[PDB]
């Protein structure tokens, strides 16, 4: 699929840098015709047929296709796409309140504050999974707040760089996100499905409640070994006054066998809730 090839600077003015990844730099921008602000994600294209630098056209088109399908309060949306010889430029919904990662760094959360965030994450993931979209890179950096200065911030899931449509219940292409957050099936290069996101949600929940990471070792390989072995525990120092239902929720997500793990629908009915890899 080919995108708009006009100069993005003819239609937008760019401002501050919002962040960067391994694929992209993201800048605040303002559309000239409307005065509305967006996040322009510049993704560097591959320069050759066999290069490791940049992102393949297949991968860029997948992220764009997935983003084009999305419309939900807890996910970012895609406004426009441009391209030139060097970059594809995705004009994304702006999330101006910073990462959940930054917010957590500033202040461990009460169970209420943690569930406030978590219910919104679950709603966003319920939407994605209903569409058979596995995000495959859920972690606190990829949850962003609309406004960080309110007592109950609204959030949006970002970073669809690893997202895939799951047509047959599993896909096999070795996707591999961030070691602290990946499920055992990712570590073991097994077929992957929507269940991998549910494991990541378990890890996120553990961190929200404690400020500690359940599998983190001193090296990436050690983290990955810990993940595969389900080598975590609830340290009393962090969890002694945390509710047993909260621990139950996490326990039912941090399950090696993806078939035995809670689904997104299960997680919403749970009594606690219910109303790249190499060094």
CB nearer to ligand ANP: pick between 80 and 111:
80
Site string for ligand ANP, 86-115 (x = CB under 6 A): ------xxxx---x----------------
Q: Residues 10, 98, 124, 165: is their CA dihedral positive or negative?
A: positive
Exactly one of 83, 87, 137, 197 binds ligand ANP (CB under 6 A); that residue is: 137
- Smaller CB separation from ligand ANP, 67 or 262: 67
Looking at residue 14, the DSSP 8-state letter turns out to be E
Q: How big is the chain by its Cα radius of gyration, in Å?
A: 19
Nearer to ligand ANP, 207 or 246 (CB): 207
Catalytic residue among 9, 102, 137, 147: 137
| Site membership for ligand ANP, residue 60 (CB under 6 A) | no
Which has the closest alpha carbon to 208: 128, 272, 275?
272
Asked if 93 and 39 count as a contact pair (C-beta separation under 8 A), the reply is yes
159 contributes a contact to ligand ANP by CB under 6 A: yes
Q: List the one residue out of 36, 17, 35 whose CA is nearest residue 27.
A: 17
CB of 24 to ligand ANP, least distance (A): 4
Tell whether residue 20 is among the known ligand binding residues.
yes
Check the annotation: does 230 bind a ligand: no
Q: Which is nearer to ligand ANP, 19 or 191 (CB)?
A: 19
- Asked whether position 44 contacts ligand ANP by CB under 6 A, the answer is no
Please report whether residue 141 would count as binding ligand ANP according to CB under 6 A.
yes
DSSP string, 258-274: TTTSPPHHHHHHSTTT-
85 vs 90: CA distance, rounded Å = 14
Find the shortest distance in angstroms from Cβ 247 to ligand ANP: 29
Choose, by CB under 6 A, the member of 8, 26, 143, 204 that binds ligand ANP.
Answer: 26
Distance in Å, CB of 239 to ligand ANP, minimum: 29
Query: Is residue 59 among the annotated active site residues?
Result: no
94 is in an annotated binding site: yes
Structure tokens at 241: 């006054």
Place of tokens 């970002």: 158
Q: How far from each other are the two terminal CA atoms of the chain, in whole angstroms?
A: 35
Judged by CB under 6 A, does residue 64 bind ligand ANP? no
Q: How far is the CB of 172 from ligand ANP (least distance, A)?
A: 21
Residue 42 CA to residue 22 CA, distance in Å, equals: 11
Find the binder of ligand ANP among 60, 76, 121, 155 (CB under 6 A).
Answer: 76
Asked if residues 99 and 143 have their Cβ atoms less than 8 Å apart, the reply is yes
To the question of whether residue 19 is assigned a binding role by annotation, the answer is yes
Contacts by residues 243-248 (CB-CB < 8 Å, ≥ 24 positions apart): 243/111, 243/272, 245/271, 245/272, 246/111, 246/114, 246/205, 246/209, 246/272, 248/272
Residues lying near ligand ANP in the complex (CB under 6 A): 18-24, 26, 39, 41, 76, 92-95, 99, 137, 141, 144, 158-159, 161
Q: Give the residue numbers marked as catalytic.
A: 137
Q: Could you tell me which residues are annotated as the binding site for ATP?
A: 18-26, 41, 93-95, 99, 159
């Amino acid at each position: 699929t080919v995108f708009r090839q006009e100069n993005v600077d003819d239609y937008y003015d760019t401002g501050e840098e919002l962040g960067s990844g391994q694929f992209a730099v993201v800048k605040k921008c303002r559309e000239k015709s409307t005065g509305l602000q967006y996040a322009a994600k510049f993704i560097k294209k591959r320069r050759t047929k066999s290069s490791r630098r940049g992102v393949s056209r297949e991968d860029i088109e997948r992220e764009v296709s997935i983003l084009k399908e999305i419309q939900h309060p807890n996910v970012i949306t895609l406004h426009e796409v441009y391209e030139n010889k060097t970059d594809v430029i995705l004009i994304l919904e702006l999330v101006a309140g910073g990462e959940l990662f930054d917010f957590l760094a500033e202040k461990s959360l009460t169970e209420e504050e943690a569930t406030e965030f978590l219910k919104q994450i679950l709603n966003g993931v319920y939407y994605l999974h209903s569409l058979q979209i596995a995000h495959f890179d859920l972690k606190p950096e990829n949850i962003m707040l609309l406004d960080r200065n309110v007592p109950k911030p609204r959030i949006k899931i970002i970073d669809f760089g690893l997202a895939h449509k799951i047509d047959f219940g599993n896909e096999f292409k070795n996707i591999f996100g961030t070691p602290e957050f990946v499920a055992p099936e990712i570590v073991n290069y097994e077929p992957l499905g929507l269940e991998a996101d549910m494991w990541s949600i378990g890890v996120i929940t553990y961190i929200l409640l404690s400020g500690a990471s359940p599998f983190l070792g001193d090296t990436k390989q050690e983290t990955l070994a810990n993940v595969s072995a389900v080598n975590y525990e609830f340290e009393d120092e962090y969890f002694s006054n945390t509710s047993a239902l909260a621990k139950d929720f996490i326990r039912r997500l941090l399950v090696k066998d993806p078939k035995k793990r809670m689904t997104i629908q299960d997680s919403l009915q749970h009594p606690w809730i219910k109303p790249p890899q190499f060094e």
